[PDB]
Scaffold this active site. Structure first.
Site, short mmCIF file in Angstrom:
data_model
loop_
_atom_site.label_atom_id
_atom_site.label_comp_id
_atom_site.label_asym_id
_atom_site.label_seq_id
_atom_site.Cartn_x
_atom_site.Cartn_y
_atom_site.Cartn_z
N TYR A 22 0.98 -1.34 0.07
CA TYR A 22 -0.12 -0.14 0.01
C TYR A 22 0.62 1.31 -0.13
CZ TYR A 22 -3.27 -3.68 1.86
OH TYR A 22 -4.12 -4.68 1.79
N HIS A 45 -10.69 5.16 -0.73
CA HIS A 45 -11.11 3.80 -0.85
C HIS A 45 -9.81 3.19 -0.86
CE1 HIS A 45 -13.24 0.03 -1.40
NE2 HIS A 45 -14.37 0.67 -1.63
N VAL A 46 -9.34 2.39 0.29
CA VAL A 46 -8.10 1.70 0.16
C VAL A 46 -7.93 0.60 -0.69
CG1 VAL A 46 -6.73 -0.07 1.75
CG2 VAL A 46 -8.15 1.87 2.85
N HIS A 47 -6.80 0.52 -1.19
CA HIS A 47 -6.41 -0.25 -2.39
C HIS A 47 -4.84 -0.85 -2.32
CE1 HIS A 47 -5.88 3.90 -3.36
NE2 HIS A 47 -4.77 3.70 -3.91
N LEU A 48 -4.80 -2.28 -2.52
CA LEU A 48 -3.80 -3.06 -2.48
C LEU A 48 -3.14 -2.95 -3.94
CD1 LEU A 48 -1.72 -4.84 -1.11
CD2 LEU A 48 -2.94 -6.80 -1.75
#
Ligand SMILES: [Zn+2]
Length: 178
Positions: free
Chosen positions: A87, A95-98
């Site tokens: 990350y 919005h969290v994103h890998l």
DNA sequence: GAATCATAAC
């Protein structure tokens, strides 16, 4: 919405953009890939940022990691490429994103120092480290000094040699492909 | 001249 920072959200809804999907997450191609293979893993449950991470998301993180690997095998198994999963310390998009990204970094969208540094410094928090971090502390530990890391001189992730500019760095990486 | 940086985007 319509705001650029909401982009990913819209893209996760679009079936065409959906590379992979299950009850917990969805995987899409990065619209401006920084390598030949660059995917984003997103949880259906809305999570704003990593600052909002507690052990209740632990399993979810692990899932995201797992899915990431599977994507590789499913879409780059034939590839000899190394992959890293992690990350960004300070995200621009909501919005969290890998990030699931191949270590070639062969892409025209890799245009500036901020891109390169975002993927090749501490600014890039490996998924594994994050997961252990939650398991051990129940929270994500971000060291200060992140924005400055983006300004560091360009350095090859392969030979550790210093480069003076992006065009030169690219020309240098070209030869590591062999 | 080429690459980078700083800043706005109505
Ligand atoms: Zn090198």
């Amino acid at each position: 919405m319509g705001h650029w920072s909401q982009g990913l959200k819209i893209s996760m809804q679009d079936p065409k953009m959906q590379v992979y999907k299950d009850e917990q997450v969805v995987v899409i191609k990065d619209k401006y890939p920084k390598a030949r293979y660059h995917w984003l893993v997103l949880p259906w449950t809305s999570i704003s940022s990593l600052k909002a991470v507690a052990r209740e998301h632990l399993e979810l993180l692990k899932h995201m990691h797992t899915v990431g690997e599977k994507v590789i095998v499913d879409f780059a198994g034939s590839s000899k490429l190394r992959f890293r999963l992690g990350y960004h310390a300070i995200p621009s998009m909501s919005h969290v994103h890998l990030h699931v990204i191949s270590q070639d970094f062969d892409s025209p969208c890799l245009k500036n120092k901020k891109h390169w540094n975002s993927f090749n410094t501490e600014y890039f928090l490996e998924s594994q480290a994050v997961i252990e971090m939650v398991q051990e502390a129940g929270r994500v530990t971000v060291r200060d000094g992140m924005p400055e890391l983006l300004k560091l001189p360009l350095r090859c992730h392969e030979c550790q040699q210093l480069l003076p500019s992006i065009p030169q760095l690219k020309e240098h990486l070209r030869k590591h492909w062999t």
